[PDB]
Amino acid sequence: RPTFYRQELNKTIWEVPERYQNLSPVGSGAYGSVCAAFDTKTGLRVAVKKLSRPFQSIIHAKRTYRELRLLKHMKHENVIGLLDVFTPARSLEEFNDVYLVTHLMGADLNNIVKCQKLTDDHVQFLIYQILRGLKYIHSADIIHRDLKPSNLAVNEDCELKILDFGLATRWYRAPEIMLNWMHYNQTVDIWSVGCIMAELLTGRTLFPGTDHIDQLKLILRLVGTPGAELLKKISSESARNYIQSLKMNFANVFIGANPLAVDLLEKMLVLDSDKRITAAQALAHAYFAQYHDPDDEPVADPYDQSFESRDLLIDEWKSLTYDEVISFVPP
Ligand SMILES: Cc1ccc(-n2nc(C(C)(C)C)cc2NC(=O)Nc2cccc(Nc3ccc4c(c3)CCCCC4=O)c2)cc1
Ligand SMILES: CCCCCCCCO[C@@H]1O[C@H](CO)[C@@H](O)[C@H](O)[C@H]1O
Ligand SMILES: CCCCCCCCO[C@@H]1O[C@H](CO)[C@@H](O)[C@H](O)[C@H]1O
């Protein structure tokens, strides 16, 4: 057991192991807060997320467990991984705080893009990594749902990790997510990738919607009204009518772009989630020829997500989370 020290951080007492130094707040919200730090034991910069009131309610408790489980499962160099999880608590009884430790890459995608056009080679490398990450995430039957530049952590070498920093926001969201559609394809994340990629290429947000409906109209304007195939999957006449108050050959936005990039964007930014390219297919797309290695695009061990369908008591989510904390083995 490490010795803990306390400090005040993001308006609470953070009790962390001494190996973790130079804790500096980088994000805060209702679900918790995150500090950049330096792990003097591994010599790595790390982000320490302290969960906020993790066992306050069933929802907090199951969220806490969800994230812990997910992070413990992710073992891919393009996906945020759990370097450490700790609690100051010495027993289940006193267990009330969970801290999660991940690599801190240093910047998110916005920081390195800073509203600039990136080179095609650079976009290749970045999107390749995202797709590699996503292939892994998706292979575990997990859908990110909120892929966006701020959830993409990159170091100086532009090595990239996908994470979920939730504690502009709407611009990378797959249209069906915004429409509370509920039967999500993993290609919700592909939509996001297309939005990210487009932005990396052009330096401009693909769909800078002012609000929900504006976002939707911007998407319809670019990719066009639903085709007959897609229309058949929308039950509501009235909704189809409403949509009709609104393709557009991917040329104009992506002028001067590598035609391969455009071809891929076209396969990503398809309204019909059933028809969007998958992460695995995208990885094999010629656009990534420089980086694609079919034998180095790992898939995840199958991920036990049964808990997602469970309505359990706080005590059980807490005890389940506690088990995961105790049984945690660093990389
Ligand atoms: C409820 C719930 C359930 C699941 C998840 N969830 N799902 C995933 C996927 C596996 C991607 C789907 C991943 C998480 N969770 C997760 O990423 N947690 C976490 C933990 C510690 C720190 C951080 N934050 C950062 C880390 C590094 C950096 C930055 C923030 C910001 C910029 C500085 C550079 C940098 O490098 C985020 C989230 C919430
Ligand atoms: C902008 C207004 C039109 C947006 C419609 C987007 C349709 C999304 O695609 C749809 O995703 C569903 C949920 O995964 C799938 O069940 C459907 O089969 C698929 O067509
Ligand atoms: C703003 C323009 C958007 C019009 C609303 C699109 C309607 C999508 O609505 C979705 O359609 C599916 C029916 O096939 C249902 O399974 C979903 O429950 C419903 O949310």
Curated annotation (Swiss-Prot):
Main localization, broad class: cytoplasm
GO cellular component: cytoplasm; cytosol; extracellular region; ficolin-1-rich granule lumen; glutamatergic synapse; mitochondrion; nuclear speck; nucleoplasm
EC numbers: 2.7.11.24
PROSITE patterns: MAPK (PS01351), PROTEIN_KINASE_ATP (PS00107), PROTEIN_KINASE_DOM (PS50011)
Active site: 164
Effect on the protein upon substituting residue 317 to R: Loss of kinase activity
Tree of life domain: Eukaryota
CDD domains, A to Z: STKc_p38alpha
Any single GO BP term: cellular response to UV-B
Consequence recorded when altering residue 300 to T: Lowered kinase activity
Modified residues (N6-acetyllysine): 49, 148
Keyword Nucleus: yes
Tissue specificity remark: Brain, heart, placenta, pancreas and skeletal muscle. Expressed to a lesser extent in lung, liver and kidney.
Entry cofactors: Mg(2+)
Positions annotated to bind ATP: 26-34, 49
Keyword terms of this UniProt record: Acetylation, Apoptosis, ATP-binding, Cytoplasm, Kinase, Nucleotide-binding, Nucleus, Phosphoprotein, Serine/threonine-protein kinase, Stress response, Transcription, Transcription regulation, Transferase, Ubl conjugation
Compartment(s) where it occurs, according to its Swiss-Prot or TrEMBL record: Cytoplasm; Nucleus
Subunit structure: Component of a signaling complex containing at least AKAP13, PKN1, MAPK14, ZAK and MAP2K3. Within this complex, AKAP13 interacts directly with PKN1, which in turn recruits MAPK14, MAP2K3 and ZAK. Binds to a kinase interaction motif within the protein tyrosine phosphatase, PTPRR. This interaction retains MAPK14 in the cytoplasm and prevents nuclear accumulation. Interacts with SPAG9 and GADD45A. Interacts with CDC25B, CDC25C, DUSP1, DUSP10, DUSP16, NP60, SUPT20H and TAB1. Interacts with casein kinase II subunits CSNK2A1 and CSNK2B. Interacts with PPM1D.
Role played: Serine/threonine kinase which acts as an essential component of the MAP kinase signal transduction pathway. MAPK14 is one of the four p38 MAPKs which play an important role in the cascades of cellular responses evoked by extracellular stimuli such as pro-inflammatory cytokines or physical stress leading to direct activation of transcription factors. Accordingly, p38 MAPKs phosphorylate a broad range of proteins and it has been estimated that they may have approximately 200 to 300 substrates each.
Recorded family membership: Belongs to the protein kinase superfamily. CMGC Ser/Thr protein kinase family. MAP kinase subfamily.
Protein name per its UniProtKB record: Mitogen-activated protein kinase 14
